[PDB]
Design an enzyme around this catalytic site. Structure first.
Site: not given
Ligand SMILES: O=c1[nH]cnc2c(C[N@H+]3C[C@H](CO)[C@@H](O)C3)c[nH]c12
Ligand SMILES: O=c1[nH]cnc2c(C[N@@H+]3C[C@H](CO)[C@@H](O)C3)c[nH]c12
Lengths: 263, 302, 278
Positions: B94, B97, B252
């Site tokens: 990502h 990072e 979520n």
């Molecule tokens: O509500 C969100 N907003 C932005 N990204 C994510 C993600 C994807 N994620 C998974 C991880 C944080 O849980 C991160 O790498 C981005 C899941 N839910 C959401």
């Protein structure tokens, strides 16, 4: 990179903590950091002359890219940042190592985007849009500082409700007539079309500060209270068609002075 | 530099190609790259024991960067899934990072040089911005918003790789219709009851979860789900000429309501419903078997 | 960097200024810079034969990352930039506006006339229409990408008066140009986003040049050629039994170039008429 950043944060703390101990007869453990934005440097006048406050120029503090003011305000010990992405928030982390600060109070001057706002009005910030952070310039970009906070930080709870209730309660008590709104601050790094865009995006006020500090303080677990001074109303109406024929600072000072006694 | 980037890509390819030629008795020509998202590493359990799969750690391949997240450093797994030769990226990079976008998509360029892959299957976790979505639902991506791209952070910035694709790439056709129909056919064949919506994914940089105003902004901009990956990989795969199938797991529901006002008599706590990484991972874990079986079925028919 | 950026701009000016001195019998002091966007190199034909124009390849001029043409157009001394630079190519915004800052040092230019190709975001625009720019949205500028009231009303009125005087039937709209980084063409959702943001046309250039020209104290006239209509409809659903193919209507550079060339004669005639009253 994070190893060097960690060492610079620890050096800054090391320096600061030593200077405090040499200066104050008793332990100085500030409860709040106050960041004074543009035109709000008069917050410093609210710091009591006894005990003698400690003043450190940024030039003197390891890793600080202005001055830090340590003293008492309305009976509470505080630090003021007079003047101000990883490096821009380095001071917040260095100060977090004192282990006493649990509130960031940050003030700024901002452009009014909400059509109801007029120059001179205040806006208590209850939400933000971090435009550069959505794109790729973010104070938390890079390896996470695991000692300070989580890899993934929620920001839906960034602006403490109780501190906002407190600020408004204090305004009604000092009977300040100045208009105060509650709204969304957009951080950007200004055309009529851009201001129109900001408004429809949900912006109430816009500026180029505050949000990186709020995010870094939240990362450290602090509560945040943020207040904007609207310096001007941005215009959103289209240009003509070719076919056509410091009173504010005073108020901010007293608000903050009141607030910190209950902090 | 592009001639430096080309050298790194050609180097990665040579390493990978030589590894394969020495490991498999038949020429190994994967037809799909599968990118496994957060909490979905279980997809690797669908790789058969025979012929023996080949596992290459990111740390051993030229130009590959490893995750800053321990101890999931990332690996390429080459093997047969439901009889089909595939390569899985078990772990992705990502930009939050600290990697450049070019670094996060470098493995796609390197793998393109094998000359056999014509499909990217990309999975991710995402926050639901569309009010009708619920945690546990899947969303088949049929469109995206690349806001960071519009604003100057784009994986194709720089001299163009003319050997790979066009200087100017359309994205109105990024999400192959027949692969999305294939996905839904497999949901039917497998009698999977989990919902699969169709909608628009938005890439944001992170690593903060979105504020209420940011989420409201994404919503008005047309976002159905938001995540911190995927779009740069899709764009790069499209540049290489691959077809793309992208599948989000809604882990979520983004909080989009305005926070409690100071003037409210009975305020909703501003912490209520806040996103956490632990919620994302646990919800990924619950939906993983369904995602695994869908992909297992899909790869036999590409 | 900055006290050295200054040196490169002065170095460019010195090179150009001496080439001009060497070439023209009389002092050559251009009053307008014309930047010729996508498929619009034809502007060059409007430069008069006498006195002979001077051409300088970008490759010989200090700091330039195309060609500069100095000559008379409809009696007016002008400079043409035949070729511009784009940030999607990997050039910093500063590098893309370096020629403007170099040419500013001649102390004679007071108008930028800038053209570009653009995608039509406003639903009523059609490929082949022009748009006189009266405002912009600088998307990379939100993140701090920067080269360092914008679009002169009187020049816009001059442009429309010339359209009328020259009996040009081609439509000239007036509206907002959104600068986005590229190099991808916009997705359907991105184009719908741009529309709701107030965009009338979208492109990948121009705004940094405008901002720089204004900083140098120049007036700006900007003209977009609408070369394609951006796809906005949601793509075919997997559940549609009669889907519209997702490839239908897709943007290509080929279409952009062809449509730029078709509108080029009208644009040339407009600019030719305008520079004489600059
Ligand atoms: O509500 C969100 N907003 C932005 N990204 C994510 C993600 C994807 N994620 C998974 C991880 C944080 O849980 C991160 O790498 C981005 C899941 N839910 C959401
Ligand atoms: O639909 C569009 N979107 C974004 N830019 C353009 C342009 C402008 N230029 C043209 C060129 C690609 O054809 C590239 O430099 C952008 C024309 N049409 C569009």
């Amino acid at each position: 990179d994070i190893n060097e950043q960690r060492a610079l944060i620890k050096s800054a703390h090391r320096y600061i903590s030593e200077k405090l101990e040499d200066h104050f007869s008793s332990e100085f453990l500030p409860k709040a950091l106050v960041i004074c934005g543009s035109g709000l440097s008069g917050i410093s006048t609210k710091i009591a002359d006894e005990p003698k406050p400690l003043i450190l120029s940024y030039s003197t503090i390891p890793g600080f890219k202005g001055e830090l003011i340590f003293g008492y305000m309305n009976g509470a010990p505080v630090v003021l940042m007079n003047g101000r992405l990883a490096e821009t928030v380095h001071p917040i982390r260095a100060l977090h190592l004192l282990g006493s600060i649990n509130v960031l109070i940050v003030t700024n001057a901002a452009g009014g985007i909400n059509a109801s706002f007029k120059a001179g009005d205040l806006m208590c910030v209850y939400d933000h849009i971090n435009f550069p952070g959505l794109c790729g310039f973010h104070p938390l970009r890079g390896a996470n500082f695991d000692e300070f906070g989580p890899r993934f930080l929620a920001t839906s709870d960034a602006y403490d409700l109780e501190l906002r209730k407190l600020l408004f309660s204090k305004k009604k008590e000092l009977n300040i007539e100045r208009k105060i709104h509650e709204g969304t601050y957009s951080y950007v790094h200004e055309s009529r079309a851009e201001s129109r865009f900001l408004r429809l995006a949900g912006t109430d006020a816009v500026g180029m500060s505050t949000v990186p500090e709020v995010v870094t303080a939240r990362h450290c677990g602090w509560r945040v209270l943020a207040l904007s001074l609207i310096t001007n109303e941005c215009v959103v109406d289209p240009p003509a068609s070719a076919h056509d024929e410091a009173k504010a600072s005073k108020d901010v000072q007293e608000l903050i002075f009141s607030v910190v006694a209950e902090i």
